[PDB]
Structure formats: structure tokens, C-alpha cells
Symmetry: C2
Subunit: 729 residues, 2 copies
């Protein structure tokens, strides 16, 4: 019959019989993957194929208790289906016939999560029966990464570089249709049948090629090789930097390929899972943002909202425009955190916190619902990230959608303005806040060739002191003063100490005592606002005198230590880098930003010239038509084009320049009839001169002059915004 | 004097001899407390206390152990120094309370009203003599604010009245507390007289509070909602449009808390006009507005729905609404409005086996806008979420969609279950009603269902699968009853037959599976004796291939918004038919005005181009004011489409002068002249057509596409 007790298993009809070696067990990533396999199998495929969905996390055998392994239903279910014995050898075909299935095929998405399942399954087999790996047992199901369709013709590519080679070798490639099939669920049931009719082109086998494979699997999953994984990622990022500089493509694993070594899989596919956590948690040094923050900011820039919108509405826009797929709760926190402006949050919030966005009372947690709070860009956001730089950035693609860039390039190092914090896999980042004006001044000093002045951490509206005990080591202190004997006033808490947390953890125990400590204070009264702290504490005269001799800041927990020893950021090329000082961050930023002001000037020169040429033709066309040199009334379109060509009119110069970066007279004839009137004609003629003067002015300006203009514009708006903030408080 | 152990309380300084003048603000969570703290500042802490409510229990419907194990109520008692057994009928005991007033500060949504009512219920149950005095109050913010000059309104009709004067300044809605900034909170707390409302006026209030929260008054609340919906229905049919200082307890229950219970009904029971719940309508409205010509990711579309329709429910709920609108397996929609491009779930797992929204794609079906014609959108009533225009109250499709894809929902007092019916039968029955004939009876019909559906009695049906005897020991099951999923049948029926229960032996020897993603094939082996015994009992009964379906709870919202129980599906069809026919009259009336304005606009545009070509109009090097005067002197009209749209709610000649110089060329002039003739012919053709003729046109267009779409579906 069939095995009893596994209702989720589609048992192969020949499994557990004479032809068991010809049977293949398909392990799928969840029920949706199993449904795809069922659709392809049809009826003929049900004799030698079995499908079982992995509806849970495969355990890491290497680092799990024997009790968990013996009670794990998922691990045990695989044992029953394949007929595997916990302690056995499978080096002889005699011992290979006790298995109900001759092959195991893992069917997962071609994303990082799917690779994790593949590796964990590989680790489970390697750690219990490394004999099976020796022969052709473990295999994987693969779908083409990209499909191109045109005129009812379809082609498939199994590697992103292969698709790029096709586009480089195929003119009019933009006339086709592009779809990406890394996820299994993207494929239809009809497409599933097509895959299973050509299983040779959708099957890959895992090959054991030596002890290097055992080392690779050990490196990936052994609990003792944590530091080895750090060097594993370190070499990967440097190898990626070298590969890009040498023009070599990204490391591909699948070609138009039938075999994949275990070592190749670990070092080229499973590595991307760990590097993703670093790439998601550690900000970039160029703009101080993580990809999630960048997606929100990119969405805000693209929307160009002149009026505030609900956070829930903006969150929908980010999901729609930037392909954000990391979760609704994460998206909400990212938007809210970009707008917070309380002491210890951003020194310069890029989004406006219009409503209850959290305060210093609860460390930003006391925010209201996203359906009730509003936000929009700050008036400083587009001054910090100038629109003219967008044309020099590298915008990324999520499948077919153009999304946020690799990084933005602000006019001052934003990573030092609002700080940075993140925990990845092997590295961690912690950078404090610094004064906006001091950073602008140091950028100006570097432009003039002077040495940068030292910078201490600075938090906006913080009323306490920050002192440097030693390089990169600081102590942040609140404010306490003795009003009289028996009374002290606490008027400031240290940075990142929240009002509610201080009252609950410090002052309440001193008033009520605990099981191990008698009360220290007799009373305390609270006089806070939403943005200021005031505690008035009463004490016994003798106990206060003792506290002063010890030190009130120490006794009342008004001191916090801050160490700058883990300033780890992604550099402009995508490699994690440990910055020893904030001046090193500023210097690295300065070189890149100065270079991109040169890039902006080159682009502006070409674009302004094209705009001037376009306006030159437009002004001439209107004037010639009024003068009668060109007649368009009741004239054939073909005749009009010939006249325009004969008279030396140019095709759309802006269009020509854009294609030049890699005839059309519509820019002339699309002009409204309004432009024949005197006033509008004069406006067009004036605009022609202004564009020419604009190009001439730019030709006389160096990249540093443009940088100084942007800094001056930003500073003026900064003073206006900050002055208004004080008036409203 | 001092309260100990409640670290979340901001005790008032005078809470004490001045306890009568002390007000305790009870806030909805920490964010509400933050707003109150911001408005209080420093000087406000002398007479005001703030405590955050981090859920009030229903005292009537709860164990007294829980009524003493709930820390939140116990903390409230401790803060306001309340004693359970006390009357406090005079100031003799009112000084035994630590605060003079309890102020409830919540959002102005349904969730906030629930907190307000439950707190009121808490006082009413243990200190009924305390709600008599000026004790319980609520914090109120203006509903609408208009903004370098700013004004505020505490009444929606007052805001509408403001529109009569001059309506663009800038408008913002402040129902949620979090909408107000800290600066605005300070302004509120300065004029606290204008932001505070106080709640007893008779025995009617006691009934109101009792009605809302008594566990025995369930059926009274159902009649309470029934009267509300019927009163609303009559007011809407009559065309009716549906601040103070004090609010009675009875007024709060009957005018504010009523919205909470009907909200569950309004979200779960679909409308009879379009067969949709509000969440589904928001998705469909987003799809119509986007008008995607290419497939889009479900994750991307979900963001668009959140951005465009003010959808504020769960993300998981939104994903399921989109996916369910696209499913096309046996038991799901007979006509899916969205295309399931990818793994959207199948009959194997009842649609639960769908892939991640970032990998599956969708777009409108080619039938969606044939079913929901764009020309009808101008006759619908589109709703507003604060300042954003969103989906309408309902769409008006050309056939009753509620009978096509069925209806299912559970509300508060009512429930809905309607099966699917055949599209062609529904179209045919609609055609019969247009001709004056009686509709034919209709049985439930599910697309691609290979079984049988029989009516035992009115509204009583039996759905059966297919089983065939192959030999003395073998039977094959080629169809399961509608809504029986392959995995659920294998796990619940066939697995126990193979293994047996604890006290019952196995019934079958073996079964083999040969399903596809859309078809079912079980080959079951038994012994000869057990098969013969099964035959005598009845194979459909033995293998559970029959399911009962009763049309006894076909409850839908009518076009006026009142829940109505339909006895037969023909009653739904007749009610739909009358409304749809009326809206075809409404469409013709709108089209007559709009087509006429378009024709007038093109007449001026064609005349303007021809006169410019003929030299009757000169614009070269001419002042704008001189050109405008010539156009008026020659009788040209201001934008007629703008004028007609303005009529439905100096001169404008931009529609003439914005035209490109291309229109002076021969071909474009001929195209403009051809378009001028086409618009006139369109208006003339419409005048000779009745509303029923337009309906028949839409049905024919829909039927042609339905055959094409369904033929391709079979081809795969």
C-alpha cells in the first residue's frame, strides 16, 4: 500500500518497491511550492515522483540538542519517507536499496531564504550520512531567472549575466517583455507543466569534489567557526570590489550547467544570506542610510508632496514605488524614526513629525497610529540632497521596477548628523550625533585646504555636557544642582535616557526602597514638559551631604559612557570598513562629494546646452512662422518636415543628448497656439537668452563654487527652520 | 496624599484639601498621555492628573475574580480613592474622593467610543450615584480645522456651512488624538472650556447603558440596530442629509456607540448591488483608477490600495482580499475580477496554498470593466476618508455580481451565505425581465464543477461528488462536493479509512492519488465484502461526497444601506434589476449632457482652427487681451465641458489656444474635423436609444468577451 501517518506526503507509486532507485522525492518550500510541483507532475509523473512540503524550520543538527532532534516532527517525517536509518552506511548499492527513494530534490525559491533551506537540508544529510553525498542523491529544482517574450517567441536565461549578454548581443531588446522567475510562485500551473516536460533543463545535481566541500559545509554551519565566517564575508566583499573594478561579472552559479559542487553552492549562494543582514543593518557612509530608509526617502523625493500625507498613505506609496517587502511594522518604524526630533533622536530630521511621533518621555515609543499622524519632507531635505545630483546616481532595479539608488550623495556627511546604529553578522555600528554647523564648517575648511577642527559629539537641544576622556571615549552627563540642603533639582538627563524610564528605574527605587536597599530619598516632584525634564528631589540633610561628597551625577545615575570603537559603515564601493575617527569619515566623504560636484557640472553643461539649443530652435520657429518664412496652415505634415529640414532646424536637442549618453520636430509643432501671441513669444525669446546666460555662468564656476552655493542655501534655510522651531516651543 | 507603586501616573499636586478641584485625565495609551502632558505643561500639573489606560472589562459579563484581578481598574480605584460600597450622594462623601472629575481622553473613532463606554459602564455598575453629579467628562478636539489664517469647527454641518462662505483654504480632520501636535495640545489646554464636555437626566440613560453592555440584552441590541438602519434607509430615500456643551448618557449610547456594532455588520456582510464588502470595493476601486495595462505585483498593488483608498485594516487582510478577488478554482469565484497570474491558491488547499505577494502578479480581467462599465462611474456616490475621495458606496454592475461569486459573512446578529449561480442563466434571466417575461428558476451552479446540485425543497440543496465502481475491489472518486478541498478530504476522510480510528478498524485497503491542480482523482481499494456493504449503505454517504446547502440566511445590504433578508435569489435579481434599469436612465441623462458639452467644445475647436487657417482669426504678434476680445466678438464659447461640469456641481479660451500648432496642419485639421462629426453622431445616436437598449449593448459586449475568455481558459 502506502505509508501511514504522513497525510501531507504525495507518496510516489513506485516508492518502497523494485524500482525505488528510479524514484525521486521532491522536498518543497511550503504548500505553494508543492502545488507547483503537483501541477507539473500531472498523472504520468506520479509513479516515480513524490512531493513533501517542508512547513517548518529545518534544525541545525551540528548545534542542536539530541532531545530536539529526536522530537522534531519535520526531521522525523523525512526519515520515514526516505527510509533512512539514523546510524547507517550508504557506500554500497546493497545498502542503497533500503531507501524508498533513490533521489531527493529540493524545490525552493531562488532567494536567500530558499538557499537557507537548501543548505540546512544539505547540512542535515552531510552530518548524519555523508555517504549519500558521495553519489548522486541530493539535487535541486531550478527555474529560469529571466524569461523574454516577443511575437509569441520565448527564451529563458538561468543567470542574470546571461540575460545581460543577450541584451548586449541583441538590438531592439527593449521591444521584448521581461519577467523574473526567482520565486516559484511567479510561475503559473501551465508553466509548471512545461518545466516538468523538460526536467533535464530544470534539474541540477550536488557533486562532492573533495574535502573542500566538507570544509565549506562546516564553515557555514559549525557553531565554532563564527570568526571564520567573518573572514569569509570580509574576503567576499573585497572580492566583489575587485571583480567590479576588473569588469568581471557577478559570480554566477548556473549556466545554460548540470552539476553544482557543494563548495561552490556555499561560497557563491549561501554567502548572500549572511551578507544581506549586514547590508540591511549597517548604514552606508555616503548618505548614512540603510536600504529601507533610502526606499522611504526615495519615495518621498519622487512624490514631491507639497502638503502633508498620512503615514499609512506614505507607507502604501513606499510599498508601491520602491518594492519594499520587509514588513508593514518595519516600514512604519522606519518612516516614524526618520521624522523624530526629540533630544537623542535626529539632529536634523529629514521628515516632518506632524502629530504624535513619540517623545523623550518614552524614547520615541509613544507614537500614535499611522492612520492619524502626518508627514512630508523637511524644507532641508532637498537642500541636503540636491535634485541636480540625481542624474549622477546609480538607480537600482527590483526586477522590472527602477527603485532607490545605491546611495544618495548629500552635501554634508549625513551619517555624522543623525548618527548610525546597527547590528549585523560579524560587525556592529555605533556612531553618535554631531553638530550640523560644525560639520559644514569642517567641510568648508577642507575645501580651503585647512586642517579639520576636532569635533565632539553634539545632540540638538541637549542641555548637558559631553566630555572626551580619551580618543573616541566620551562621558555624557545630565544637570543636577543643590537648591538647598535637603533639596536638589534635576534639570537634564543624559542623552538616550528617557523620562519615564528614569523615574521608574532610578527615582522610584530611591523613594520606595527595594529588598536589598533602603530608601535614599524622602520625596520627589515632577515638573516635566514633553521636551524638557525637571525633577525636584527631597532628601535627608545628612544623606544629601553624603551624596554630594560621592558625587550627585554618579549617585543619581546622570552619567552615560559612549565609545566610538565600532564605527563600521559600508564605503562607497560596498565594502564594510571600520573608521577609526569621525575625521576619517569626513575625509572619505569629502573626496567622494568633491568628485560628484565635478560629475554634476559635466552633466549640467551638456543638459543646459541641449536646453539652450532646444530653445534656440523654438524661438526661431515661432519668429519664422510670424514672418512668413514658414507656413503651416493647411499644409501636409510631410511637406512641413521637409521645409524644417531644408531650413536647418534641429531635431529635439535634449532628446539627442539623452540618447547620446546611452528627424523629430515635435518639440516645435507641439507648442500651443499661445506661443504665437506677442506676450508668450516674448517670454520664449527671453527664456532663450536666460538659458544661454545660465550655461555661461556655469562654465565660469568650479565644482567647489557649486558646493559653496549649496552650503550657503542650506545654512540660510537651516537658520530659518531652527529659529521657527524655538518660537513654537 | 501620595499614591505609591503606580509609576505610570502623573499625580496632580493638589490631589489633598483641593481634591474637589482636581481632574484626573484617563488617556487611551501612552501617546494620548503624551498629548495631555504636552498641553498641561508645568502649571497644569497642579490640578490635573494623567493616567494611561494600557482594556476595561465588561463588569456585567465578567467573573468577580477578574473584576479584582484586573490591575487597571484596581489602579483607577486607587488613584481616584474610590470605595466600592459607597453612595457619595452629597458633598459629605465627595471629599473622600481624591479627584473631583474623571476625564476620558480617547480617539474619536469606534475604538475610542468603546473605551469611553466601558469606563462609563464601570462607574454605572459600582457607583451609580457618581454619574449623577458633574463627575465624568470627556476630552474633545475640533472635528475639522481650516488653515496664514486658521479657524476650527466642532461640527461637520458647521464645516459644510463654512463652505457656503467663499471652498479652497486647507482642511484637516482631527478625529484621532495623534493628529494634534504638542503645540496644538497647548492651545487646547488653554481654552479647556471649549475642549471639554460633561455627561444623568432620567431613567432612559440607565436603559441606554444597560442596553449596550448587558449580556442578556443581545436580542434588544439587534432590534436596536434594525431600527437604526431602517431610520437611515427612510432618510436616504427622502433625500435628507442625515456644537453643544453637555451630552446625556442616553445620547452617547444611541448616537455614538451605535456606530461600533454596525461597523462589524458593515464590514462583513456584502452589498446586494455589487456583491462586495468595503475592503473588496477598495481594492477594485484602486484597480479601476490605476488602469494597469500590464501585470503588477500583488505587493505593489497592496501599497497602491493603502495609498489610494485609505485602507487602514491589516496588511494580511489586504493581501487576502486581493488574492481572493483573483482565485478561479472550483468553489471560488465563477467570474474572477482579478487575474491570478502565479500561484494564487488552488482547490488542493482551498486557496490557502498561495505564494508570497512579492512573487505573484495580477491585473484586471478583461471582463471587469465590461461588468462595471466606466460610463456608470459618473452616477455613483464616491465616499471620502477625511480629505481623500475613495471608493463609492457601491458599484452598479450590468448583472447581479452577488449571485455570480456568492456572498459570505458573519456580523453582529445577522449572517450571510449565498451560493454561486451561472453567469449565462443570470444574463438570460435579466434579458427576460427586460422583455416583461417571468424569470426562470435558477439552481446554484459552480464553474467547472463536475458533480450534481439538486433542490430537495425551496432554498434547500444537496451538492454531490462523483464516484464510480471499477471492479470488485476498486472505486474511483473523480469529483468532490463544492468547497471540499483535496487535502482536507484526504486528511479527514480517506486517511481515517486507511488507518482506522481508536475503536474502528480500517475500511479500505489502499488509495492512490492522481489529482492535478484543478482535478480530483482518488482510486480506492477495498475488500469485496466491504465494498458491497458500502454500496448498500450508499457510496456517496459512505465516502462523504454529499454536503447540504441552505439558502435560509441570504442577508445583504440593500442599495440604501439597510440589512435585508432575501427569501429567494429571484428576489435579489428583481431588486437588482429595478435599480440597474434606473441607473441606465441616469447614465443616459449624464451622457446627454456630457456628450453635448463635448460636441460644443469640438465645434468651437474646429471653428477656431478653420478660421485661423482661413485668416478670419489672426493671432501672430497679437496681445492676449486683443485676441480674447476678438474671440468674444466672434461668438466663441468658453470651455463648454468646464461650463457643464460647473453647472452639474472672465471667459475661458485656454482649450482653444492650448492646441498645438500641429492642428493647423492638414491631416490634424481633418482629424479634428472628423472627431467633430463623430461626437455629434454619438449624441444623435444616444438620443434614439432607450436605457434598455444601452443595457442590451453592454450585455452583448460582455457575452462576446466571456466566450472568448472562457474558450482560452479551456485551451490553457
Amino acid at each position: 500500500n502506502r505509508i501511514k501517518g504522513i497525510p501531507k506526503l504525495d507518496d510516489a507509486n513506485d516508492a518502497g518497491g523494485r524500482n525505488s532507485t528510479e524514484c525521486t522525492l521532491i522536498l518543497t518550500e511550503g504548500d505553494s511550492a508543492k502545488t507547483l510541483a503537483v501541477s507539473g507532475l500531472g498523472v504520468v509523473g506520479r509513479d516515480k515522483y513524490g512531493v513533501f512540503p517542508l512547513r517548518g524550520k529545518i534544525l541545525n543538527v551540528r548545534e542542536a540538542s539530541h532531545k530536539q532532534i529526536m522530537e522534531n516532527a519535520e526531521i522525523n517525517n523525512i526519515i520515514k519517507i526516505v527510509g533512512l536509518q539514523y546510524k547507517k552506511n550508504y557506500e554500497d548499492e546493497d545498502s542503497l536499496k533500503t531507501l524508498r527513494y533513490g533521489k531527493i530534490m529540493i524545490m525552493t525559491d531562488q532567494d536567500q531564504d530558499g538557499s537557507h533551506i537548501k543548505g540546512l537540508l544539505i547540512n542535515f544529510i552531510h552530518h548524519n550520512w555523508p555517504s549519500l553525498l558521495r553519489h548522486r542523491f541530493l539535487e535541486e529544482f531550478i527555474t529560469p531567472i529571466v524569461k523574454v517574450s516577443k511575437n509569441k517567441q520565448e527564451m529563458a536565461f538561468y543567470s542574470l549575466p546571461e540575460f545581460e549578454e543577450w541584451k548586449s548581443s541583441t538590438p531592439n531588446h527593449k521591444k521584448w517583455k521581461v519577467k523574473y522567475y526567482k520565486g516559484l510562485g511567479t510561475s503559473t500551473s501551465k508553466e509548471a507543466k512545461e518545466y516538468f516536460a523538460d526536467m533535464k533543463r530544470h534539474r541540477i545535481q550536488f557533486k562532492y569534489s573533495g574535502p573542500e566541500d566538507d570544509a565549506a559545509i562546516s564553515l557555514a554551519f559549525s557553531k565554532k567557526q563564527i570568526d571564520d565566517r567573518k573572514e569569509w564575508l570580509t574576503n567576499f566583499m573585497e572580492d566583489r570590489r575587485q571583480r567590479k573594478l576588473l569588469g568581471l561579472p557577478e559570480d554566477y552559479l548556473y549556466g545554460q550547467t548540470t552539476y553544482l559542487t557543494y563548495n561552490d553552492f556555499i561560497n557563491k549562494e549561501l554567502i548572500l544570506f549572511s551578507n544581506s543582514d549586514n547590508e540591511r543593518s549597517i548604514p552606508s557612509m555616503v548618505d548614512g542610510l540603510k536600504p529601507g530608509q533610502r526606499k522611504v526617502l526615495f519615495t518621498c523625493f519622487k512624490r514631491n508632496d507639497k502638503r502633508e500625507v498620512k503615514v499609512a498613505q506614505l507607507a502604501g506609496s513606499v510599498a508601491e514605488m520602491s518594492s519594499y517587502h520587509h514588513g508593514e511594522m518595519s516600514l512604519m518604524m522606519t518612516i516614524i524614526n526618520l521624522a523624530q526630533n526629540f533630544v537623542g533622536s535626529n539632529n536634523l530630521n529629514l521628515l516632518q513629525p506632524i502629530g504624535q511621533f513619540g517623545t523623550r518621555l518614552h524614547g520615541g515609543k509613544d507614537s500614535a497610529s499611522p492612520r492619524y499622524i502626518f508627514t512630508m519632507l523637511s524644507s532641508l531635505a532637498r537642500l541636503l540632497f540636491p535634485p541636480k545630483d540625481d542624474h549622477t546616481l546609480k538607480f537600482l532595479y527590483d526586477d522590472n521596477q527602477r527603485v532607490e539608488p545605491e546611495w544618495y550623495i548629500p552635501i554634508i556627511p549625513m551619517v555624522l548628523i543623525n548618527g548610525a546604529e546597527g547590528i549585523g553578522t560579524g560587525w556592529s555600528c555605533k556612531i553618535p550625533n554631531f553638530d550640523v554647523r560644525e560639520i559644514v564648517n569642517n567641510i568648508r575648511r577642507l575645501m580651503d585646504g585647512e586642517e579639520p577642527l576636532p569635533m565632539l559629539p553634539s545632540y540638538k537641544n541637549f542641555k548637558g555636557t559631553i566630555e572626551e576622556l580619551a580618543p573616541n571615549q566620551y562621558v555624557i552627563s545630565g544637570e543636577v544642582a543643590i537648591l538647598n540642603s535637603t533639596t536638589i533639582e534635576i534639570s537634564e538627563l543624559p542623552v538616550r535616557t528617557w523620562t519615564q524610564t528614569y523615574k521608574e528605574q532610578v527615582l522610584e527605587p530611591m523613594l520606595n526602597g527595594t529588598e536589598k536597599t533602603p530608601p535614599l530619598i524622602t520625596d520627589y516632584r515632577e515638573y516635566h514638559t514633553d521636551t524638557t525634564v525637571k525633577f525636584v528631589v527631597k532628601m535627608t540633610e545628612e544623606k544629601l551631604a553624603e551624596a554630594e561628597r560621592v558625587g550627585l551625577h554618579k549617585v543619581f545615575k546622570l552619567q552615560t559612557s559612549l565609545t566610538c570603537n565600532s564605527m563600521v559603515l559600508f564605503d562607497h564601493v560596498g565594502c564594510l570598513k571600520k573608521y577609526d575617527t569621525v575625521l576619517d569619515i569626513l575625509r572619505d566623504f569629502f573626496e567622494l562629494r568633491l568628485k560628484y560636484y565635478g560629475l554634476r557640472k559635466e552633466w549640467l553643461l551638456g543638459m543646459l546646452g541641449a536646453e539652450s539649443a532646444k530653445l534656440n530652435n523654438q524661438a526661431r520657429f515661432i519668429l519664422e512662422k510670424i514672418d512668413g518664412k514658414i507656413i503651416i496652415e493647411n499644409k501636409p505634415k510631410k511637406e512641413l518636415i521637409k521645409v524644417l529640414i531644408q531650413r536647418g532646424y534641429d531635431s529635439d536637442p535634449v532628446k539627442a543628448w539623452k540618447e547620446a549618453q546611452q528627424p523629430t520636430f515635435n518639440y516645435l509643432l507641439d507648442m500651443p497656439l499661445w506661443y504665437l501671441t506677442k506676450e508668450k513669444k516674448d517670454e520664449l525669446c527671453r527664456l532663450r537668452n536666460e538659458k544661454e546666460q545660465e550655461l555661461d555662468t556655469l562654465k565660469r564656476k568650479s565644482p567647489s563654487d557649486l558646493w559653496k552655493e549649496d552650503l550657503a542655501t542650506f545654512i540660510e534655510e537651516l537658520e530659518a527652520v531652527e529659529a521657527k522651531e524655538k518660537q513654537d516651543g
